[PDB]
C-alpha cells in the first residue's frame, strides 16, 4: 500500500500468499479451509510452489512467532471467465483464533451505499525505502461507477489523499462495514495506476460472485 499507515495489530483475516518462498500478493480468509484471492496471483500451476501464511503482522513473520500458521495449497478453484477471482483450498485447515479469523462475505447482489468508509490491507509496494514488513492499510470511500470509467456489474468504485493498493497487495480484500458488520466487498486487482490521486481504484465486486463462492464451498470437499 502506498501512502497508507501501518496497522497497530495484525488483521485476522489477512493471508500472505507465498510464491516460491516469496510473498507475491494478498488474500483474505473466509472459511477455515478457503481463501479468496485474485487470478493474477498464480503464475504457476504446480501446487507445491505455494504456501499460505496466516496470523502474521510481519510479512516475514518476525514479530508474530507465537501466532503464524503456514498452510499448504491443496487446490485452486478458478472463478468464472472475467471474474479474476480464485478460491484457494488448503490442505490442512486453519486453526481459528484471535490472530487467525474469518471475514464475512456480503449478501448476493447488494449495492453498498456511496461514501461508505472502506479499507485495503496488504504487504505490497510502499513507494518508500525500508519497508518495515508490517501490514499496511489505506482508507477509501465507495464512489459512483461513472467516477471510475473515464463499468461491468462485477466491479465497484472506491477512492481516497492519493493512496491505495499497489503491486504486492493484489488478491487482498476491500473491507467495508455496514450495520456493524465488516464484510469483504471487493478484491484488489491491478488497476490502471498505483495510488494516483483523484483516480479511484477498480475492485472486482465480491457481492457479484458471492453466490458463486458458496457453490464452490458446498461442492469441493475438504479431507
Amino acid at each position, epitope marked *: 500500500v502506498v501512502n497508507g*499507515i501501518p*496497522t*497497530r*495489530t495484525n*488483521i*485476522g483475516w489477512m493471508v500472505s500468499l507465498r510464491y516460491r518462498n516469496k510473498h507475491i500478493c494478498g488474500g483474505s480468509l473466509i472459511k477455515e479451509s478457503w481463501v479468496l484471492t485474485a487470478r493474477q496471483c498464480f503464475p504457476s500451476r504446480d501446487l507445491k510452489d505455494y504456501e499460505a501464511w496466516l496470523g502474521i503482522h510481519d510479512v516475514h513473520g518476525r514479530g508474530d512467532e507465537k501466532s503464524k500458521q503456514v498452510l499448504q495449497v491443496s487446490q485452486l478453484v478458478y472463478g468464472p471467465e472475467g471474474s479474476d477471482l480464485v478460491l484457494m483450498k488448503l490442505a490442512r485447515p486453519a486453526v481459528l483464533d*484471535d490472530f487467525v479469523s474469518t471475514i464475512d462475505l456480503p449478501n448476493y447482489g447488494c449495492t453498498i451505499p456511496e461514501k461508505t*468508509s472502506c*479499507s485495503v*490491507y496488504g504487504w505490497g509496494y510502499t513507494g518508500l525505502i525500508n519497508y518495515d514488513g508490517l501490514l499496511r*492499510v489505506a*482508507h477509501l470511500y465507495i464512489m459512483g461507477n461513472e467516477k471510475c470509467s473515464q463499468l461491468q456489474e462485477s466491479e465497484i468504485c472506491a477512492g481516497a489523499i492519493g493512496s491505495g493498493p499497489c503491486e504486492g497487495d493484489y488478491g487482498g480484500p476491500l*473491507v467495508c*462495514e455496514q450495520h*456493524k*458488520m*465488516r464484510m469483504v466487498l471487493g478484491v484488489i486487482v491491478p488497476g490502471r495506476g498505483c495510488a494516483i490521486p483523484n483516480r479511484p481504484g477498480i475492485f472486482v465486486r465480491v457481492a457479484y460472485y458471492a453466490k458463486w463462492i458458496h457453490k464452490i464451498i458446498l461442492t469441493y470437499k475438504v479431507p
Partner: antibody
Amino acid sequence: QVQLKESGPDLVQPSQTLSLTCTVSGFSLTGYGVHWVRQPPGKGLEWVGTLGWNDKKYYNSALKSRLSISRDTSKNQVFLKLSSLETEDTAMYYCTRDGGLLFAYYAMDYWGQGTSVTVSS
Amino acid sequence: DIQMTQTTSSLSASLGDRVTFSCRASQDISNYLNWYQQKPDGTVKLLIFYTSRLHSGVPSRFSGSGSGTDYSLTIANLEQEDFATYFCQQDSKHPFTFGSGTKLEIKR
C-alpha cells in the same frame, strides 16, 4: 452515527471504588476498542487505559494496581472500575473509540462528552 | 514512560495567522503521534492520526509534520473556532501518554 456517553455517579468518597459505564452505539465493541481518559480540574488530559477489540487490557502506569476495565458486548457497554479512591482521582472522565480493525490505528477518533467525578469526604 | 514534552503552555494569535504547536518525545516514536482539540466547553475532537494523516471531518487548514522525536501541528488561515487547547499523544508503546497541551488565545 457513532455515539458514546459516560454515566456513573458524580460524587464518591475516598477509599471507595468508582464505577463508570460507557454506553456505545453505531459500532460493535467486537471490531473496535474503547479508551478511558481523565482530566483533573485545570490540568491536561491523562490516559487511563483501554480495552481492545479482542478483550486485551492495558492500563495507565500509576493507576494500574487499582484499575479494571470490562465489557458486555450484548449490553453495548464498557465498564470502568477504580479501587481505593483518592481525592486526587477527582477529574472529568471521558470514553473514546479506536479505529478498530477497519481503521487499525489506536487514535481516539470519537469522543464522549464526559462526566464529572469528584472525590472528597 | 514515554514523556511527551509540550513546552509552550499558551500561544497568542489573531485571525488568519499561521500558528504552530509542537511536541518532543523522550525517544523515537516512529510517527505514532496524534493531535486533539479541546474546546472551551471541554469537547475533544481528533485532528490528526499518524504524524500527518487528516481525520474525516477536519477542515483542510490543518496539517501534520514530524519524525523520530519532534512532531508538530500547524493551522494556516486561523479561524475563530480554532481558539482551543491542542494536545498531542504517542502510540509507540503502552501506556499512551499526552502532552501538557497548548491553549491558543486571541491576541490584543
